[PDB]
Design a protein around this nucleic acid. Structure first.
Lengths: 65, 190, 234, 69, 35, 171
RNA sequence: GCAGUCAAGCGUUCAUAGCGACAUUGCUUUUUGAUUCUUCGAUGUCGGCUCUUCCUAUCAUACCGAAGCAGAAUUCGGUAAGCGUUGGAUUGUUCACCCACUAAUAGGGAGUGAGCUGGGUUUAGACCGUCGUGAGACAGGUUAGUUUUACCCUACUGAU
RNA sequence: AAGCUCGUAUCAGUUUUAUGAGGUAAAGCGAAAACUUUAAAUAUGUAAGAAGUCCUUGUUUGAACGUGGACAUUUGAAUGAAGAGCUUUUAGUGGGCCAUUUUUGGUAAGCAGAACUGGCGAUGCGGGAUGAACCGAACGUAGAGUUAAGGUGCCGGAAUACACGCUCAUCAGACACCACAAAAGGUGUUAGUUCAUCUAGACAGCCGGACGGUGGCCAUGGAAGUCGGAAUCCGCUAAGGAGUGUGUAACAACUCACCGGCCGAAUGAACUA
């Protein structure tokens, strides 16, 4: 992970860095080898967390494309 | 489905006489007499002509009609017992320790003594039943023959003889000693 | 029997039931060939090794041999006088009893009635006949073929078929070192005896073909005269 | 969460010139024992690693003869 | 399967023979109080 | 109850441009006449779009049995909505009149399929005129030549509270 | 857990609007048993004697079933609670782990401040540390750290 | 109530009619579903005579506005009937649970917020073994009769009544209940639906056939239908798989898949309750 871009239900929790369900986070995607038009190399994108990671350990997220 | 009537037939040969009071069946044949007590089965007996006896159940269910062919078969077994008799043939095998079998009377009781089973020192006795005669068949080493009028005595005695010699705590793939039933036929033959 | 009933056994094989169309096609073929030849015999071949049957077939590629359900052949011919394709047929249709059996041909009667007179093969007892021999199993190692060859050329019987002879064929056997052994004289059949079911099996186990099988005839029909002639050959 | 065109927009691209520059500037470190780190300048680090080896690790034998073979 | 066994995307030569709006997927999740 | 069978003839109300409607008729099984009228209106409204409010009952009579003392076999056809998806059903009843056959069918449906009077719809009661057309075995087993059987075993009725005889279920 | 694939049925009739059991793939670090020297914030109470009794979700003892079960020793299961289920070392913490003996050292409930006490109750004191301009408060730390009845009615135990 | 001006044929937690509103088809039918031509309600507003009709027409003929007479009580739908309105002020009260009916929003599952309507508090009595919310029910003192809800083997007043079915449970069942484990598993039993086989003979049993190219190809010590891999074809038939299991080091041997012989009338599968 690289940042917590936006957490619903408050901006204070976005500041504190909380990872509840629905949070939007920024992940490093150099392992997927994405190239943009003009030939640059993406290494950071947005994903949404899709579980309550207080009822397990994993944080599960879906990329935003 | 509660049929109005179910029925079976028992055919009687030309030597034997069956006589049925309330439900105490008695068959007398060219070989002896046999009695059975069917008062727990709830059927109606009827004689037709000295060679045929019909058994019937009036308005009976599935479990009640199941117990009808079994009565037919018990009476048939009694008839074939008093005409042909039964002979079971058992055999014992061994690897190292010879099974030594004998008939011994213990105060007028006729036990069967089995010694040296797998080297054991216990003397297993099996009490012969009253009505079944036992003898060791010649011309065949290790062969014991039981015969009689009743099946439920010959077969039970054979079962006791077979189950008295189990092999506890050993591989029953490697250890083959025992006494097993070889054949179940009639005295006549042929 | 809403419950507590016999669960039938399903099995995964390639072939399928033949159905009604096979009976219909056979009953059509016999009737539409009935008016292509002239002589229609009937045969009684009960226990026929299929290679022998095929030899009989190929002994002439000019005449057709038909085999099928007995009642189907009857339904082709006609049961009562009041139904039949051709005329006077019932008088041979009322005769076919066993595994019949219908031979179409385009040949004189005598050649066929002598071909079926001079034919016989060697085979097994096919039980409930008479036992035409008297052999005893020797009293040592029971060899594969039974003991009626030079025993020093034979290989001892395999171990895997001891329980058959010990349970089903009712023969007192024991198992020493891998050879199967017997110690008492044994009698299978007495020559001149009605053979019950077990003796034919015990005999066929030792591969001694000692039975004459000849095809037999019971009736016959000629078309251009249209009247049956029942001649018995055995 | 409202809809927006950010979120479905790239955020952290990098170019080949920067990649080659940074990759060439990782074999010229010359650590000083008296300099201490203050910040690290977040970079895509899995693309600038992987010095050359000479080993070529073992092949998977399980893809040909699993175990029942 | 047995019963059916009676009657009955453009990859290169080296890639065959091998194998393997602006809304967000989760709007309006439940709310969590400060307690 | 003790059922009866009625014939109910109803009709839509008159109106200009539509005088003299077409006089529909039904046979209904019920215990009295009010229930028969109710069932008539229910079945009309269910069949198509006629309403008690817009129709009228032309007549309602009772239908007796023509030969109430001759044993007969009937086939009954029923449809009922309980509990899940409905289903039709054909039964055979050997009795003496259409009313009693229906009564025993209702008691039997209640005993078995947890069914009540407003879930059941009699579609047809038809006499099986020709023997060997009967299907069900529990009826077929009463049509054999020279039928005889004894009464159920081991039953007996008493009124005294103390007896001096140790009874016999004669037999 | 999340994202998919499948496909018996269900769903008013219905695949394709929809659900959808059983099966299945993606990965949370390294294919050669190499040592992984994580041991990372419990805000509230466990831990231990004396003594009964109950549950079975069985460690041992009795009897059975299955295993490449040759013998010996084992492993996985069935009935079964009749009987038993230990001695010590460790607070620069013991919500544990060690080494012995043994047939075996199973898991729990009723617990338990009137039958006993350890950290932890807080107090009367005092000092050190942090904070506060100060009186003082605490992120702390150390030391100090009293509860006794029945002689009443019942229950239990014995006695007239 | 203090009290007084007023029971004035006017009022009403009600229906009917006229009409708006839901407009959902579920009327019901279209000019090539594509309506609005139009229901039946579901509770939803308003209106239904004396402060009303006509004659006659002066001002800012149609708009309000002034005027001088005609108009009668079955005087303008149904049901019930005498308890609505000001003034004085005078006593208590001013914050809450259960359930049903709509509506909105909800997640592991609960539920949460609005509104109507009953119960309770202030309230006894009959029934549910026992109960504030469950079923009945108009509280002076007594006599007699008939019942509600619940019941009727004994406790316990009242049929060990009558009629038709189902059920055997080594913790049956007799439930605030139609929510929770609840979808399935069972060779327990009973009824039903849909498909098939069948006197040119079914299902179960015995007995016979189960063949030829061919020990098909690649494999390798040996692999002949049966350790494995790729096809899975041809001929002859009534039928017979380049083979469903047992078996051999390889074979042989037995077996079913499929045919036929003996016997003789009903049988099988899936599915629902």
């Amino acid at each position: 992970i690289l940042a917590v871009k936006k957490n619903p239900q408050s901006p204070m929790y976005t500041q504190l860095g909380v990872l509840t369900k629905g949070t939007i986070i920024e992940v490093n995607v150099s392992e997927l080898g994405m190239v943009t038009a003009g030939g640059k190399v993406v290494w950071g994108k947005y994903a949404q967390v899709t579980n309550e990671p207080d009822r397990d350990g994993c944080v599960n997220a879906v990329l935003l494309v | 489905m509660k049929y109005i009537q179910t029925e079976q037939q028992i055919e009687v040969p030309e030597g034997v006489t069956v006589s049925i009071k309330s439900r105490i069946v008695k068959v007398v044949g060219p070989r002896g007499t046999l009695t059975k007590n069917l008062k727990h089965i709830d059927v109606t007996f009827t004689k037709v002509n000295n060679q045929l006896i019909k058994v019937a159940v009036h308005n009976g269910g599935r479990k009640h009609v199941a117990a009808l062919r079994t009565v037919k078969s018990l009476v048939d077994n009694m008839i074939t017992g008093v005409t042909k008799g039964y002979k079971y043939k058992m055999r014992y095998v061994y690897a190292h320790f010879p099974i030594n079998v004998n008939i011994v009377e213990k105060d007028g009781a006729k036990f069967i003594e089995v010694r040296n089973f797998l080297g054991d020192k216990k003397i297993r006795n099996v009490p012969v039943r009253d009505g079944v005669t036992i003898e060791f068949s010649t011309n065949v080493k290790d062969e014991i023959v039981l015969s009689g009028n009743s099946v439920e005595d010959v077969s039970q005695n054979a079962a006791d003889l077979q189950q008295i010699c189990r092999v506890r705590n050993k591989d029953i793939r490697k250890f083959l000693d025992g006494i097993y039933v070889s054949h179940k036929g009639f005295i006549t033959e042929d | 029997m809403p419950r507590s009933k016999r669960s039938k056994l399903v099995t995964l094989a390639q072939t399928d039931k033949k159905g009604r169309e096979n009976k219909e096609r056979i009953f059509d073929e016999v009737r539409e060939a009935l008016d292509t030849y002239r002589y229609v015999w009937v045969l009684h071949l009960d226990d026929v090794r299929t290679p022998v049957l095929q030899e009989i077939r190929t002994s002439w590629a000019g005449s057709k041999l038909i085999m099928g359900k007995r009642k189907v052949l009857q339904k082709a011919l006609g049961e009562k006088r009041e139904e039949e394709y051709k005329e006077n047929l019932y008088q041979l249709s009322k005769l076919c009893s066993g595994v019949t059996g219908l031979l179409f041909t385009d040949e004189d009667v005598n050649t066929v009635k002598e071909y079926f007179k001079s034919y016989v093969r060697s085979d097994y007892s096919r039980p409930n006949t008479k036992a035409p021999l008297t052999f005893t199993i020797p009293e040592g190692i029971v060899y594969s073929r039974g003991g009626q060859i030079p025993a020093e050329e034979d290989v001892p019987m395999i171990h895997s078929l001891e329980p058959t002879m010990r349970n089903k064929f009712e023969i007192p056997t024991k198992i020493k070192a891998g050879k199967i052994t017997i110690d008492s004289p044994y009698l299978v059949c007495t020559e001149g005896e009605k053979l019950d079911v077990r003796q034919a099996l015990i005999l066929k186990q030792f591969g001694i073909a000692a039975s004459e099988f000849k095809v037999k005839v019971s009736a016959y029909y000629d078309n251009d005269s249209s009247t049956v002639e029942s001649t018995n050959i055995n | 969460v409202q809809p927006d065109r950010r979120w479905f927009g790239n955020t952290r691209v990098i170019s080949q010139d920067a990649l080659q520059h940074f990759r060439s500037a990782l074999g010229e470190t010359q650590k000083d024992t008296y300099q201490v780190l203050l910040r690290r300048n977040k970079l895509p680090m899995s693309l600038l690693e992987e010095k050359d080896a000479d080993e070529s690790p073992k092949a998977r034998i399980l893809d040909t003869e699993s175990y029942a073979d | 399967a047995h019963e059916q066994s009676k009657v009955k995307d453009a990859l290169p030569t080296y890639l065959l023979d091998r194998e393997q709006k602006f809304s967000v997927p989760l709007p309006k999740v439940r709310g969590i109080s400060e307690e | 109850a003790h059922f009866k069978e009625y014939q109910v003839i109803g009709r839509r109300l008159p109106t200009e441009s539509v005088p003299e409607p077409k006089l529909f008729r039904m046979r209904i099984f019920a215990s009295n006449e009010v229930i028969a009228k109710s069932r008539y209106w229910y079945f009309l409204q269910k069949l198509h779009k006629v309403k008690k409010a817009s129709g009228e009952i032309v007549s309602i009579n009772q239908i007796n049995e023509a030969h109430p003392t001759k044993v007969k076999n009937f086939g009954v056809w029923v449809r009922y909505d309980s509990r899940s998806g409905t289903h039709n059903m054909y039964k055979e009843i050997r009795d003496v009149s259409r009313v009693a056959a229906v009564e025993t069918l209702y008691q039997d449906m209640a005993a078995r399929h947890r069914a009540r009077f407003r879930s059941i719809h009699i579609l047809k009661v038809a006499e099986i005129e020709k023997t060997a057309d009967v299907k069900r075995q529990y009826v077929k087993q009463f049509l054999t030549k020279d039928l005889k059987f004894p009464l159920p075993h081991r039953v007996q009725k008493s009124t005294k509270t103390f007896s001096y005889k140790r009874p016999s279920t004669f037999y």
